Design a protein around this nucleic acid. Structure first.
Ligand SMILES: [K+]
Ligand SMILES: [Mg+2]
Ligand SMILES: [Mg+2]
Ligand SMILES: [Zn+2]
Ligand SMILES: [Zn+2]
Ligand SMILES: [Zn+2]
Length: 144
RNA sequence: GAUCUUCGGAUCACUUUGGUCAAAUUGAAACGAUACAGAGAAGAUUAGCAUGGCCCCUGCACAAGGAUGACACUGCGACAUUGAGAGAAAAC
């Protein structure tokens, strides 16, 4: 993950996108330091937020604007700058706007069911449109 | 929203919330100190191992320690009464 001055030089298309990744890292640090205003699980929601956003940025670089070479993209996934499993989920129908990967797997729930965010809002009542407790998600379903 | 399909629709996904319990006087324990006595076995100094359980503490322990860890170690009536006398009473 961490790169030294004497490490192998990343592929060519890296430097122009290096600064924004640096900004992502900076704010992740700030979120780590920032404390208060939530329950034991709510304070850990913004982490997944930024993480999904960062992975989506890389996904947008490759699959929507073809701004990065395939070599650089494999390098980025190998350096954990993006979550390979989350991107794999984004590449199949029904999970285009997946929030995180803990809201899809059923072994982490009380009754073996996915999260509320995975459910389309059309069949969900108006009153029970609440923030996810896993990551604060406000609706994953591809329809919305 | 993506995919087809023919502008009828079909696919793809589909219900969270670990809760000694709401931002700390008044529902997570157990005591400091001061004041009193103040160290087992029939004189005195003193080794210990035990018995009993709504007494525990240290210990990983079915070792061993904590004053021999401490407290306790007793005691009574399924007694049948007649054996006899005396004054009274009621009775040989
Ligand atoms: K002694
Ligand atoms: Mg002993
Ligand atoms: Mg003893
Ligand atoms: Zn979600
Ligand atoms: Zn999630
Ligand atoms: Zn969720």
């Amino acid at each position: 993950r961490l790169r030294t001055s004497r490490t192998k030089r990343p592929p060519d298309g890296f430097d122009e996108i290096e600064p924004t990744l640096i900004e992502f890292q900076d704010r992740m640090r700030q979120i780590e330091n920032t404390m208060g205003k939530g329950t034991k699980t709510e304070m850990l929601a913004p982490i997944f937020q930024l993480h999904h956003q960062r992975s989506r940025y890389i996904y947008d670089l490759y699959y929507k604007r073809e701004a990065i070479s395939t070599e650089l993209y494999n390098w980025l996934l190998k350096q954990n700058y993006a979550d390979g499993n989350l991107i794999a989920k984004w590449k199949k129908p029904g999970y285009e706007k997946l929030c995180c990967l803990r809201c899809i797997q059923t072994a982490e729930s009380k009754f073996g069911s996915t999260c509320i965010c995975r459910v389309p809002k059309s069949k969900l009542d108006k009153d029970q449109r609440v923030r996810c407790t896993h990551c604060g998600c406000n609706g994953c379903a591809s329809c919305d």
